[PDB]
């Protein structure tokens, strides 16, 4: 009863960071060694756990958040970070326990002329709470004049396309990111490593 990590990492499509996807993983055997012992992930950070011993751990549930962002912002997916991604798109809590895994997907997710279907939130009145998701598209009031729902000089559409193109520099190429959160609740564990 293997956990469906293939469905998440080798997913048919990846979601926009502003609308990041969450899959709940429960009641299965998780083999992380296949994950860590590979060259496929540029980043494999973990907080509160050791990567070598993940197969020794037992959890009540796992949440898999996934999305695409630019490479230069992947460092922002960490406790205590600031920036457009952490502030307006996906915010990790200070006490996060879990792993953030990321890899360049230019070969899968770029198109000549730009993929405009991937978006991120560029403007927001306040920072997101941890694990909060905001999918609203209200016009952002950047100046003193009310916008009344009309796009204009100081009244911005709140989302922005990355426009990933294959000729971008590596720092500006698309990276797919999956954050696995390990839920620790006062209950019996249902997702454990191989016995």
């Amino acid at each position: 009863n293997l956990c469906p990590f293939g469905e998440v990492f080798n997913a048919t499509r990846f979601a926009s960071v502003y609308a990041w996807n969450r899959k709940r993983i429960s009641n299965c055997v998780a083999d992380y060694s296949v994950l860590y012992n590979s060259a496929s992930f540029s980043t494999f950070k973990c907080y509160g756990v050791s990567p070598t011993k993940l197969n020794d751990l037992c959890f009540t549930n796992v949440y898999a958040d996934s999305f695409v962002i630019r490479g230069d912002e992947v460092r922002q997916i960490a406790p205590g970070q600031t920036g457009k991604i952490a502030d307006y798109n996906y915010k990790l809590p200070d006490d996060f326990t879990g792993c953030v895994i990321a890899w360049n997907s230019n070969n899968l997710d770029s198109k000549v002329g730009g993929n405009y279907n991937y978006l991120y939130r560029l403007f927001r009145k306040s920072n997101l709470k941890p694990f909060e998701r905001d999918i609203s598209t209200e016009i952002y009031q950047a100046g003193s004049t009310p916008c009344n729902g009309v796009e204009g000089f100081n009244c911005y559409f709140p989302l922005q396309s990355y426009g990933f193109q294959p000729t971008n520099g590596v720092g500006y190429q698309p990276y797919r990111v999956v954050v696995l959160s390990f839920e620790l609740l006062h209950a019996p564990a249902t997702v454990c490593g191989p016995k």
Partner: nanobody, 121 residues
């Protein structure tokens, strides 16, 4: 802020060896770990080696033994040695640092210009 400069790329015949040098600036090099990755045209980016601040090193399985990674804090530099190169290693190699000090595991936070290496025939 953080700047990485890479040198040592060139043309090498099969079975030869090469040395690549990466120098960092704009941040505390001693405390941060270092990593080397490679990108093949038409294929996704893949990591080849990593070295931690404490001296721990991680080598990719398909390149284990042949590749070597070392760090010199005096010059704030990292040296990457390639031995017994093969045509499958033709790619653009990039040098990366940790995006954040916290956490456990290898991290590629910043990306440099990189250097192209190709094997002649």
């Amino acid at each position: 802020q953080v700047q990485l400069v890479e040198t040592g790329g060139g043309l090498v015949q099969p079975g030869g060896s090469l040395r690549l040098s990466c120098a960092a600036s704009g941040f505390t090099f001693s405390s941060y770990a270092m990593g080397w990755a490679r990108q093949v045209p038409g294929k996704g980016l893949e990591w080849v080696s990593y070295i931690y601040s404490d001296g721990s090193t991680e080598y990719q399985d398909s390149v284990k033994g042949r590749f070597t990674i070392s760090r010199d804090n005096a010059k704030s530099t990292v040296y990457l040695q390639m031995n017994s190169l093969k045509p499958e290693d033709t790619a653009v190699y990039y040098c990366a640092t940790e995006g954040s000090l916290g956490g456990w595991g290898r991290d590629f936070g910043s990306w440099g210009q990189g250097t192209q290496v190709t094997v002649s025939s």
